[PDB]
Every structure is written in structure tokens, then in C-alpha cells.
Design a protein around this nucleic acid. Sequence first.
RNA 1: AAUUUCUACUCUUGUAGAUGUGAUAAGUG
DNA 2: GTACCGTATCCACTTATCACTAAAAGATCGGAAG
DNA 3: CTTCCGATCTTTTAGTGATAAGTGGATACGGTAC
Length: 1001
Amino acid sequence: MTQFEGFTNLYQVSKTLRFELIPQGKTLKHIQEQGFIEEDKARNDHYKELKPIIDRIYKTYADQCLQLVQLDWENLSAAIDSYRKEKTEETRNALIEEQATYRNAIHDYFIGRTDNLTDAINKRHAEIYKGLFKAELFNGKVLKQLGTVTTTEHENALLRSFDKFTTYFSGFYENRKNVFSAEDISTAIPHRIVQDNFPKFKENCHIFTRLITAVPSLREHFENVKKAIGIFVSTSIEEVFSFPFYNQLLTQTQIDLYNQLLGGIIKGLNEVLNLAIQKNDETAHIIASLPHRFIPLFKQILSDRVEKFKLNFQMPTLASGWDVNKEKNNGAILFVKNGLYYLGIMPKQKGRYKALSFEPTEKTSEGFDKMYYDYFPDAAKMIPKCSTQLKAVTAHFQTHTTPILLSNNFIEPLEITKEIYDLNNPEKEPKKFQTAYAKKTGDQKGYREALCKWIDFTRDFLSKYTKTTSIDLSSLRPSSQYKDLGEYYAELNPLLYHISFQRIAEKEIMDAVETGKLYLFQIYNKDFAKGHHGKPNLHTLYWTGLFSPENLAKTSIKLNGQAELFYRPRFTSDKFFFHVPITLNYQAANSPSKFNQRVNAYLKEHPETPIIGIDRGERNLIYITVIDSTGKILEQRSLNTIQQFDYQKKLDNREKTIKDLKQGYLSQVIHEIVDLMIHYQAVVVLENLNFGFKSKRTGIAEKAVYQQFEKMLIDKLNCLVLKDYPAEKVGGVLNPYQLTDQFTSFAKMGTQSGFLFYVPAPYTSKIDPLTGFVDPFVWKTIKNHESRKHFLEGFDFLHYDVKTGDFILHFKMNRNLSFQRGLPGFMPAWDIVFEKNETQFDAKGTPFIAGKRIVPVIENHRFTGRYRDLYPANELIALLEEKGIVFRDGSNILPKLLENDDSHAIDTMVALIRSVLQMRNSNAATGEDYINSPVRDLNGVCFDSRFQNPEWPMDADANGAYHIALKGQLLLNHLKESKDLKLQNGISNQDWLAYIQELRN
RNA sequence: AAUUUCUACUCUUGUAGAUGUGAUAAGUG
DNA sequence: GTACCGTATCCACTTATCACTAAAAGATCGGAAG
DNA sequence: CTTCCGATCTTTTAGTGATAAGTGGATACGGTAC
């Protein structure tokens, strides 16, 4: 079985680091001599003022292209109706596939190969699609072929100013591909049309024909609304709410008119429906019993309805890669000198660029240590960059069937037959070695043969290519044993990455600095100062562990390319910022796989793991409870004071910039929760925020702040390092703890994310930690006098107890259903004890009155806040002896107080009832916060948190945290009884109540 | 109150935690 | 005192996507042959 | 003088896997009103 230390190196995680750059020597002076910063600022300004223009080009082509759509939609309507009726995974896959083919069909409309258009117009659209993601956007063929857009002379000079520099737009270029892609991404126009916008129109047409079949008299009414605004006058109303009209409403203008016809501007259709409903006649009732509103349609994509400068040093792809081959054109290098780190940027020389090419020197010689970065990039995107997909081999193979020998950039000629090009290009979307072919066709032996041939071919290429022939590949498994090539690529990719270090003479370096031929900066933060004394930052730990020698021996933290430079005009003077991304757990796979299943397997193998419940308290900001497998608690904690600094005492006296203090407080408490997590080897539970909205008195009140606190808790638990831990130890810098799955979205992540669970919010604070009893009555229904008589007659019997002086009330769940909430308990009979108010002492001998309650005062039928204390037994005996009832007999007092039917007596009696079943009682003026249950348990004692017993929660905050931990225990027990290593993805209040009452009574 | 950046302090010209950046688009209150 | 109806959120905040790239391929310029 | 050749710098370009899967709703001070 696995251990808790086994949850490391599961999947990669990409992070980034930020540093300041301190100029070295005359370097800044040379920059101040050369004036690159003003030109880079002008380049950035021109880019940001040219972005709307190129955006306008994109909008014009998008509208001009999608105005010609001639596709029908009834088949995908039938598919989505079938999935709505059935929710079958076969119907789910069919719906996904049919949406995908519709997206590809309108993509062929976009890229000009659809059969519905003329092949000349198709070729024109194909040329435009090829042009729109290339350098010919800048004073090239695109603007001439699409003459619909006029450009002023200033705007042509602005477009010309980026000559030979389109790579600066290149990432944005790829971003526009995300607009025009068809791979189900939410930014894509095909996903907006096929998957997002269409179901709203389908629902609108369905509810319209339902309304028409219900009553047709509004139909002509709709017609004059269509004549009120004068929109779509060439067509009728029922033609608009039909499938062939969805061949219109693709441009943003048509969507705008369709939305404004419903919303008005001047009467609209929705307000016409509102006046029809407000008539409250029979037709209003039959349309109020049906969905009587139309949802609007979403707006189309990219259509209208201290700052810093990016630095490039007039040299594109600056720090795009660290490789020595691309060191010539990227110009970014690193040096290490007695613990300090330096960044070298060689700018382009006068006219042409001249390389520097420092020679190696002896290690014993004084000077810097230049790093050498050998990195063949990802095999998927690199192996077909050479061999097949070379223009020469594709042309030759289009002409001949003979295998071709290539020798350029090879240490030995490599042969490629037609078979390998057929596996990599089978003219179909699923390639023969690809898993989609095995999924669709099921030919597993042909899949195995194609995989073996491809694996042998890429092994031969890795042996023959000049960048990779030096690298040893003996660690690879034999070819026929790989079950899929994704695992092979994840295995092969770490073997193609190496970092060396070679000493460079100091004199050459600072001579290059002295002439200005090499620019040198020092990577710097607080921790690299000479007065550094304490524990360093986490990013400093990653940066140090990146260049540690045993990390160079085996790379667990990988240095990425794509580094950026910024200039900020701390803020006393201008500063240079350097941003660099890194990848941690590089030896592991790129994506998590069955992470929750692995966590449940460990949890089933380790039933003794504790549970930490997290709760938002009223007095304490965040409360912590740690309990065992049997539900007995181990630790209660209030996190108001973190590192001997109270935080409530800052919030209260500063509330009379809150958000940044809240962020800082959550950042401090995240270290505490992760310390308890790693100390107890346990699981943690948080409340599910989307299933409740409470805590108007808790300092952490907003949904947003707790929601993003869970965001950073998930991010922190995704990869976890500790400053005290050694680097090679599990939990260290190069072996971080991975315990939670990657965040995708709060709606799609479910309830369990690794070792972190989620629990529905209510019925956690105001509930007995000994009996699980809760108040069953909604009290907004208790207003009228006969209503409170039915409230009184719903109870069984009440009688004084002579022995201990308390009162005994009985209730059963089969009665008083008119005022009872719809959540019955596990047992059918509850016994309320009205405890006599007597003085007792807690575990430390603090005097306290048992059974005391506090209720708010009411003035002008409204609360005022002066939260006033009362003694429920004293008021009960006061109103009891108000009219003189004998009670020492122990008889049923309820019909004796019921027969007189005094309205004031029933009012104060139900007020006393509200007093006694008020679960928690907390007043901030005197600081009381306590839980007092008017129900005795099986042992025979009613719970009261004023006793300060360490077996039970101190406070209602701790009570809620304990009950959240108990809900996590319920989820864990449901996991133990389950066999699929999954969960129910949610628990109801009734099952939770029944569970806690069965296992606690 | 000194920070790649943020929060909280000043035993220490500093300290304790957190810290994926850049770009784009959409939705909501 | 029992229905009951609407107000306070208006610039910010939250969800999706992708790049984390050497090297081929193509444009560009300076020098030599008819 | 005009044209064809190789160095040199900018762009673009290759593409793997593997399931989640369909998941439920929810008002609140407060004030004014018959």
C-alpha cells in the first residue's frame, strides 16, 4: 500500500518568478547613451493603439464571413432534445460529436472549403484565412484583397512602423486563433454559435410555440410589437422564432435587434408580457402557470455593443529561449558568481549583429560561470518538425513512392519510407498510432503495429539527429512494451533537457561590459541583500533549488523559456523587472490522471486519518477543529491571532483598504492550515460556498473573499514546499507535496479535490454536538393568534419535575406539520427539557447561571439591537403563577394554560418557546458566545458549552467547525462503504441529520 | 517602516508567511 | 398588527483559453559574372 | 550597368492523452399601510 509521502511527483505544475534587475557598471549608462527605452515605450504605445485597428479587421472579416451561413439546425435540435430527455452517456457522446461536426462545418465556412459555397469564393476565403495569421497583415495582401476597410495615412504609417517585427504580435496572433478555432473552447466563435447561443434560441422558440398553443391572442399582439419597434419587418413573428431564422442572427447587429425587440427601448415584448400577467385575469393565470419570459441572446465575440513597458531592445524573440543554438538570436544568458546571479543581454550591433561567443576557461580561474542550456523541445511538436512535414519529403512523396534519405543537419543519413508518412498523415483526423483510431475503430493489432513502427522510427531519429545523438537513450523501455505513446512522450521529454556550467574569465566579461557590447544585470530581491539574516522566501527557494547540483544531476525543477523584461518609470526611481517561468515536478506527467481515485484508495487503505474542519466564526475570524476517525475531537483553535498578532483587533478598530488586509490575513492563516495538514497527515474540509449564503456577522462575510481563499488554498496545496525541510526530502524544494487536483472552475470541480473535501453549509452551527437536535419550526409563519393556538395544540404534554425543579416537554414528528420545517429527524419523539436556572461552575470554577438566554428587543415591530438577557424558567413560572396554576402535582400544564385562551398568555408563551429553542446565544457587548441545548442526551445531561469541557466545543464557532468535520466524516464513511472509490457529490440535510442522530443517539 | 509584489511588524540597513506572469475574450452583480 | 413589496451595488469581479520554442523556411542584402 | 549567387535575419511551425459528465437552488431591511 501507499504512504502519505507517496503523494509527490504526480504531475507537472507551471509557476513563474519575478525579480528586480540591478544594472552592473556602465550598462545603464550605455542604455542611457543608446536610448532604447524610449523606442521600446513608443513601440508598446503603437502596439496598444494598433490593437483596436487589427481587431476591426478581424471583426470585418468575421461578419463578412458569417453573413453567408446556409446550414440547417433541426438535427442538432433533435440531438439536444434526446439528451435532455434521456441524459444517457451515449446520447451525450452523440450530442458532443454532432456539435463538433457543426463546429467544423462552420469552420469550413470560415476557412473556405465548404461544399455549399463556390470554389472560387472558397479559395478566396482560404487565402484570407491563411493570410490572417501571418506577417502579411502589415501593409500586405490582406488589406488589398478585403477592400471593405478604409485606412487613413496615419494608420498606414502606424502599421508600417512594425516592419520586420511582427513576432512582437505573435502571441496575440495565436490568441486570435482561439477566436477562430473550432475545438470546443469558450472563446471560439463556433462554440458560441453551436453550443452557447443556439440553446437559448431553441428554448425561446419552444416556449413561444407552447404559449401560442396555450393562447393565440397575444400573437397578433406580438406582431404590433414588431410594428412598434419596426424590426424584422420583412418576416413574420412565428417565422422569427423558427429554425430557418437561426440562419440569420449571426452578426452582432442582428443579435442586438433580437435582444432589443424583447427588451424594448418604447414598448418591448417582455413588458407586454408583464402587463398581460398583471391583468390577473384567466389568461394571465394560464400564462403565469407556464414559462412566460424569453431569455436574451449573448453578444457576439470581439464586437462592439504603476504602469510598465515591455522591453525588446529592438530585437524580436528576446529571451524566448535559453538554448545555446538560439543564444545567438535570443541573446539572454545567465551567470552564477559566488552565490549571486546575473543576466546578460547582448544587443544588436551597428547595422548587422555581431556575436560574442565566450570561450570556456578553467574552473579554478576567477570569473563567472555561464550556464549552458541543451533543450530539444517537446517531442510532439519537434519530431514532425523534422523528418516528415519537411517540404522536401512531402513534395518527393507526392511525386514518388521511393523512400527518401535525408542528411542535412544529421550525423548520419536517415531513411523514411512511405509507410511512416502514411502513419503520420493518413488523410484522416485519427492517426494510426493515435488513440482516437483505437477508440473509433477498435483495431488494436494495427494500433500496436503502427505504434511499434512509429516508436522505432523516432528512436532511429533520436539516435541520428545531431542535437540528440549525444544524448543517451538507454533508459527507455523496449519498443513493443509501451501501451500508449502519450506515456512514452512523457517519459522521453525529460531526457532531452540538460544544464551545464562553465567558468568564464572575469576580464573578458567586464571588457564586454566596458565597451557596451554586453549588457549585464544582477537578478535581485530582498533575500540577496548583504544584510539578509533570516529564512528566505519561497521563490528564492525555487531559484536556489533550480541551480542546485543534484538538481543538475536529475532535473526535478525545469527552467522554462519565454522570459519577459519590463521597465517601470521602491517607486522613487525607475526599475527593471525580470519575469521568468519555471516548471516543477518536470519528471512527472503533464496532466493529472485519476487523482481523486488515488486519494480515495489511500483513504480506504488508511482509515485512521484525522479530519480538520474549517469554519467561519462570529468572534474568531476562522476556527479550526481536528477530530479522529471515531469523531472524538483532538484540537480546537481560533486563528484570530497568527504569529502573536491578533487580527480581529485590527479589523474592528480600522473599520470605523479592508480587502488587502483580508488578503493578508488569509495568506497568514494558509501557513497554519498547511502546517496542521502536514502534521496530522489528514484530510481537510471546507464549506461548499455555492450551496449557501449565511454569516452576515462573521468578519469574513462576503462570498468572494472566502471563495478566493479556497482558490489560494487549492493553489498552495497543488504543489507544496516547506522552508525548514531539506531539499531532497519529500516535501522539500525538488520533491514537493501534491495533494489537490488542479483548479479548473468552481462549478466543474465537484466536491472532492484530492485531500480537500466540501460540505453543504447549513445545519452545522446551531445543532447539538451530543444529540444532534435542531429547532424544527420556521418562525415567519407564526404571526396570527389562532395560528399560535394551533402551535400550542401541536405539542404533546408539559409537566413540572418535582425532583430537580425543571420542566419536561414532549413532542413527536408526526404532529404540528403546519409549522414544522420539511426535514424530519431520525427518531420520531423529541424530549425538550426546560432546565431550571441554577448557578454552576465550569472546569476552572468560573461562576455561571445555567439555562440563561438572550433575545433581541423589538420596537415598532422592528429590531433595534439592544440584545437583552432573560431567564426562561423564571418567566415561565412568572406567567404560570400570573393566573395561579398548581404545578407541584406534576400534571399536564398544557391544557390548563390552553383552556383560558388568553391571547397575551399565548404570545408570551410562544416567546418563551422561542427563547428556549434559540440554539446559540451570543452578545458582543458583554462578550458571551455559547451553546445551550434544552434536550438531555442518552447519559441524561443537557449540553451546555459554558462548562468549558475539552471533550466538546468551547464555542458555537467550534461547534460549527466540529459539525463540518462530522460531515466530512460522513463523506468518508460513505467512501468506505462504497466500492467505486467515488462519492455522492453532495449530501442532503435529511440524510446528514439522520446520520448524526443515529450515530450520536 | 525598509519588500519582485502583497499583508503584518521593526531584535536585526531588516523579520514571518503568501506570491503564474503576459495577452485576449465573454458573463455577472 | 397583518400582508406585502422593493431596494442598496453604477467599476469591479469572476470565468474561460493559450505561450512558456528550436529550427525550418522564407525574406533581404551585398558581392561577383556577362 | 544588370543579374544571379550565397550569408544573415525574421517568421512560423510542428501537435500527444485522457475523463471528468451532466450537477440545485436562493433572498432581505424596512417601511409603510389598510
